[PDB]
Design an enzyme around this catalytic site. Structure first.
Site, PDB file in Angstrom:
ATOM      1  N   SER A 129       0.821  -1.222   0.000  1.00 35.00           N
ATOM      2  CA  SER A 129       0.000   0.000   0.000  1.00 35.00           C
ATOM      3  C   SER A 129       0.865   1.287   0.000  1.00 35.00           C
ATOM      4  O   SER A 129       0.300   2.401  -0.185  1.00 35.00           O
ATOM      5  CB  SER A 129      -0.952   0.063   1.251  1.00 35.00           C
ATOM      6  OG  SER A 129      -2.072  -0.907   1.057  1.00 35.00           O
ATOM      7  N   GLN A 186     -11.190  -4.151  -0.187  1.00 38.46           N
ATOM      8  CA  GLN A 186     -10.660  -4.901  -1.333  1.00 38.46           C
ATOM      9  C   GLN A 186     -11.687  -4.952  -2.425  1.00 38.46           C
ATOM     10  O   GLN A 186     -12.970  -5.047  -2.189  1.00 38.46           O
ATOM     11  CB  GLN A 186     -10.436  -6.395  -0.856  1.00 38.46           C
ATOM     12  CG  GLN A 186      -9.448  -6.602   0.306  1.00 38.46           C
ATOM     13  CD  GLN A 186      -9.992  -7.321   1.565  1.00 38.46           C
ATOM     14  OE1 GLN A 186     -11.155  -7.160   1.965  1.00 38.46           O
ATOM     15  NE2 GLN A 186      -9.126  -8.082   2.220  1.00 38.46           N
ATOM     16  N   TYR A 241     -10.525   3.222   5.082  1.00 37.44           N
ATOM     17  CA  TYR A 241      -9.398   2.921   4.162  1.00 37.44           C
ATOM     18  C   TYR A 241      -9.804   1.859   3.166  1.00 37.44           C
ATOM     19  O   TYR A 241     -10.389   0.771   3.520  1.00 37.44           O
ATOM     20  CB  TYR A 241      -8.201   2.403   4.988  1.00 37.44           C
ATOM     21  CG  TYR A 241      -6.935   2.218   4.181  1.00 37.44           C
ATOM     22  CD1 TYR A 241      -6.687   1.021   3.537  1.00 37.44           C
ATOM     23  CD2 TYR A 241      -6.004   3.253   4.070  1.00 37.44           C
ATOM     24  CE1 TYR A 241      -5.505   0.830   2.827  1.00 37.44           C
ATOM     25  CE2 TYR A 241      -4.796   3.072   3.343  1.00 37.44           C
ATOM     26  CZ  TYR A 241      -4.543   1.861   2.808  1.00 37.44           C
ATOM     27  OH  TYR A 241      -3.404   1.644   2.143  1.00 37.44           O
ATOM     28  N   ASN A 248      -8.731   0.016  -0.787  1.00 39.56           N
ATOM     29  CA  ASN A 248      -8.072  -0.076  -2.073  1.00 39.56           C
ATOM     30  C   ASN A 248      -9.032   0.226  -3.222  1.00 39.56           C
ATOM     31  O   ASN A 248      -8.585   0.742  -4.248  1.00 39.56           O
ATOM     32  CB  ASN A 248      -7.597  -1.552  -2.331  1.00 39.56           C
ATOM     33  CG  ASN A 248      -6.507  -2.003  -1.445  1.00 39.56           C
ATOM     34  OD1 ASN A 248      -5.774  -1.237  -0.843  1.00 39.56           O
ATOM     35  ND2 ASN A 248      -6.388  -3.367  -1.332  1.00 39.56           N
ATOM     36  N   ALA A 255       1.738  -3.360   3.001  1.00 39.11           N
ATOM     37  CA  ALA A 255       1.994  -4.807   3.079  1.00 39.11           C
ATOM     38  C   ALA A 255       1.490  -5.504   1.865  1.00 39.11           C
ATOM     39  O   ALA A 255       0.602  -5.057   1.151  1.00 39.11           O
ATOM     40  CB  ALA A 255       1.427  -5.423   4.375  1.00 39.11           C
ATOM     41  N   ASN A 287       5.665  -9.674   6.148  1.00 38.32           N
ATOM     42  CA  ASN A 287       4.638  -8.700   6.597  1.00 38.32           C
ATOM     43  C   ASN A 287       4.515  -8.824   8.126  1.00 38.32           C
ATOM     44  O   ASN A 287       3.824  -9.710   8.623  1.00 38.32           O
ATOM     45  CB  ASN A 287       3.320  -9.042   5.941  1.00 38.32           C
ATOM     46  CG  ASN A 287       2.174  -8.149   6.377  1.00 38.32           C
ATOM     47  OD1 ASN A 287       2.374  -7.195   7.111  1.00 38.32           O
ATOM     48  ND2 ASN A 287       0.947  -8.490   5.946  1.00 38.32           N
TER      49      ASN A 287
HETATM   50  C1  LIG Z   1      -1.767  -2.108   1.620  1.00 31.76           C
HETATM   51  O1  LIG Z   1      -0.785  -2.336   2.265  1.00 31.76           O
HETATM   52  C2  LIG Z   1      -3.146  -2.750   1.664  1.00 31.76           C
HETATM   53  N1  LIG Z   1      -2.969  -4.129   1.371  1.00 31.76           N
HETATM   54  C3  LIG Z   1      -2.739  -4.417   0.086  1.00 31.76           C
HETATM   55  O2  LIG Z   1      -2.554  -5.543  -0.337  1.00 31.76           O
HETATM   56  C4  LIG Z   1      -3.780  -2.403   2.975  1.00 31.76           C
HETATM   57  N2  LIG Z   1      -2.841  -2.674   4.018  1.00 31.76           N
HETATM   58  C5  LIG Z   1      -3.174  -2.643   5.270  1.00 31.76           C
HETATM   59  C6  LIG Z   1      -2.047  -2.877   6.063  1.00 31.76           C
HETATM   60  O3  LIG Z   1      -1.150  -2.033   6.092  1.00 31.76           O
HETATM   61  O4  LIG Z   1      -1.928  -3.921   6.736  1.00 31.76           O
HETATM   62  C7  LIG Z   1      -4.510  -2.345   5.642  1.00 31.76           C
HETATM   63  C8  LIG Z   1      -4.965  -2.289   6.942  1.00 31.76           C
HETATM   64  O5  LIG Z   1      -6.391  -2.057   6.846  1.00 31.76           O
HETATM   65  C9  LIG Z   1      -6.706  -0.943   7.506  1.00 31.76           C
HETATM   66  C10 LIG Z   1      -7.803  -1.123   8.547  1.00 31.76           C
HETATM   67  O6  LIG Z   1      -6.181   0.151   7.303  1.00 31.76           O
HETATM   68  C11 LIG Z   1      -5.531  -2.098   4.719  1.00 31.76           C
HETATM   69  S1  LIG Z   1      -5.324  -3.162   3.279  1.00 31.76           S
END
Ligand SMILES: *C(=O)[C@@H](NC=O)[C@@H]1N=C(C(=O)O)/C(=C/OC(C)=O)CS1
Ligand SMILES: *C(=O)[C@@H](NC=O)[C@@H]1N=C(C(=O)O)/C(=C/OC(C)=O)CS1
Lengths: 358, 356
Positions: free
Chosen positions: B61, B117, B147, B149, B313, B338
């Site tokens: 992200s 997602q 939050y 995607n 992640a 991660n």
């Molecule tokens: C980006 O990292 C994205 N995942 C993509 O594959 C988001 N990553 C999170 C994380 O950093 O673990 C997310 C946590 O979800 C919230 C509640 O913010 C969101 S998905």
């Protein structure tokens, strides 16, 4: 000057002066970024002192463009935010009607009908607090634009509060000096008096009277050379070395509100280019320019649009001014006269000139 | 590096790697403007390949920071406005819930509950249209942040339409190239596979899976050198020669919404500095937190005294980037596991706090 600039200036301005009976006039045309200067007539009719490149004219409401840019610079310095309540910077302004009125509403005449002029009877800081504490709005904040010296005047006064500098000292050190505006003043010092044009009203020689928030709304005096530099600076802000001033000029051309085909900046007003000339010409007449009009918030504000007509009119008892420019074309015009003659005649002349040159 | 930078980094990162069992990590500290690099461990455990300064990691992200800047550069070009309705750029989005949802709402997760997602069964751009048309908001636009995607991902996709370029081409030509990020990729080319680390999830080697709006929300891979250059670019946008990009970087760090002590930018998230480390440490952690937002009207231009950051992640990678414009100070942490976000923030804060 190239012949095409001389020809359209002479054909447009020289007859306007005859028609409007203007005693003295200076005009700068900025063309491909470079200034060309034209002068006519007298700064002081009795002395027969000619208008020159050094003659200071009262800019009247054109001053609001300096106030807008000084506020823009204070935002860039992180001293103020346009989302902040007015009372953050004036903690004594505690009456309930002020809840919800932000610096953005003061800067853009959208507080809900603050009056065109600060009453002549308001003289002291104490009078001024009482006038704002007693003001009752005609509409909720952020619904109606009503052009008002008492709106942007208060914005400028509050914008400088975090810096601890007087409005004059902030304007000189943060705006005039970095741009080398070496003959531009809020208070004309004795050395410049011999260059300070007289204004003419009903044939009498006049200068503007002191007034509350005058510096911030209508109090700058400048020459055609320094106003040419001011246009250049606002045409091409990335040329400015000082980071916060470069930012401040950009923020003053952001579009915060739309009414009709115009957009309200900080001090500056803007329309897309090409414009309908009847729109800026008729829109400049005071029966439209001073009327309340409903605004749509532009959420978030559009950054400065290159392909814009950016402009502002200004008058005092004895003087009439106009500045307009189009960033995309690197083209602008300044028109300074020592008579207050109708806005539409200024806008029409400036339009004829710029439209010929683009 | 200066022994003090060396010592704060090693005494922070060494125990992090031990406690979290991270196979490989790279860190860059930007200090007074200059980068300092550190690497540990393995990019590929089976092939015994070490992490180096040319190892590619999946940013997950953190990719949203490139999407917010590419969006900011489109606004600076005059191609879009954040105040535009979404339907201006996708007029097939005729369902009535779309009235009033602007590109600003998409970019800042405030459209009214678009989901985290995009579902896996969405492949084609017709499946994507059907997903957005059928989506039912929980809230009015601009009232809550969730939050997502699917929110900033659609923003990325629409922001490039007027350009006539693919998202990948616009990103390449308008952001990566101008900033000399020449080892940053949405799709890793064959020539660069030798440098692509594996991620590790339950001891298995994994790479991110294709998915809809992946490029826009989570699909960038980069090196520690190019990420340090990205941090430098965001710390000092005035040094960037391309005018619209310099402006786009500034727009991405403007404060559009506030929730608690955090402000939402375009991709980037910001807090005032000095920051309470508890605000950012716990703040980085929950599968869905819906939070009411207050609009910043109008948005505050990028504030130099900010802690500006983004976590990221994928199944096999954990990334973090944070910087403080007024101190010319930044950090990038890239790892091929991660591991929990609070552990990232805590390390970063312990390093940057020591250096200022
Ligand atoms: C980006 O990292 C994205 N995942 C993509 O594959 C988001 N990553 C999170 C994380 O950093 O673990 C997310 C946590 O979800 C919230 C509640 O913010 C969101 S998905
Ligand atoms: C600025 O120029 C300001 N006047 C300052 O003295 C504005 N301009 C006017 C104008 O264009 O003539 C104004 C005229 O106001 C009237 C006719 O009451 C005032 S506001």
């Amino acid at each position: 000057a190239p012949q095409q600039i001389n020809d359209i200036v002479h054909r447009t301005i020289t007859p306007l002066i005859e028609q409007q009976k203007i005693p003295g006039m200076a005009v700068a045309v900025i063309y491909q970024g470079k200034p060309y200067y034209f002068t006519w007539g007298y700064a002081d009719i009795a002395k027969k002192q000619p208008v020159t490149q050094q003659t200071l004219f009262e800019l009247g409401s054109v001053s609001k463009t300096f106030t807008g840019v000084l506020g823009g610079d204070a935002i860039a310095r992180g001293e103020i935010k346009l989302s902040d309540p007015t009372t953050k910077y004036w903690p004594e302004l505690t009456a309930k009607q002020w809840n919800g009125i932000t610096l953005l509403h003061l800067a853009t005449y959208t507080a809900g009908g603050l009056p065109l002029q600060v009453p002549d009877e308001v003289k002291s800081s104490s009078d001024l607090l009482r006038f704002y504490q007693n003001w009752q709005p005609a509409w909720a904040p952020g619904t109606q634009r009503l052009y008002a010296n008492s709106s942007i005047g208060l914005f400028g006064a509050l914008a400088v509060k975090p810096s601890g500098l007087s409005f004059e000292q902030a304007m000189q050190t943060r705006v005039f000096q970095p741009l080398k505006l070496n003959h531009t003043w809020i208070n004309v010092p004795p050395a410049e008096e011999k260059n300070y044009a007289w204004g003419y009203r009903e044939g009498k020689a006049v200068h503007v009277s002191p007034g509350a928030l005058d510096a911030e709304a209508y109090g700058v005096k400048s020459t055609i050379e320094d106003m040419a530099r001011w246009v250049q600076s606002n045409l091409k802000p990335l040329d400015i070395n000082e980071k916060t001033l470069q930012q401040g000029i950009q923020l003053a051309q952001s579009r915060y509100w739309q009414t009709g085909d115009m957009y309200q900046g900080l001090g500056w007003e803007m329309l897309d280019w090409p414009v309908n000339p009847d729109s800026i010409i008729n829109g400049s007449d005071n029966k439209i320019a001073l009327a309340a009009r409903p605004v749509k918030a532009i959420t978030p504000p559009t950054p400065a649009v290159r392909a814009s007509w950016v402009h502002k009119t200004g008058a005092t008892g004895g003087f009439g001014s106009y500045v307009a420019f189009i960033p995309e074309k690197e083209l602008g015009i300044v028109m300074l006269a020592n008579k207050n003659y109708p806005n539409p005649a200024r806008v029409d002349a400036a339009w004829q000139i710029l439209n010929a040159l683009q």
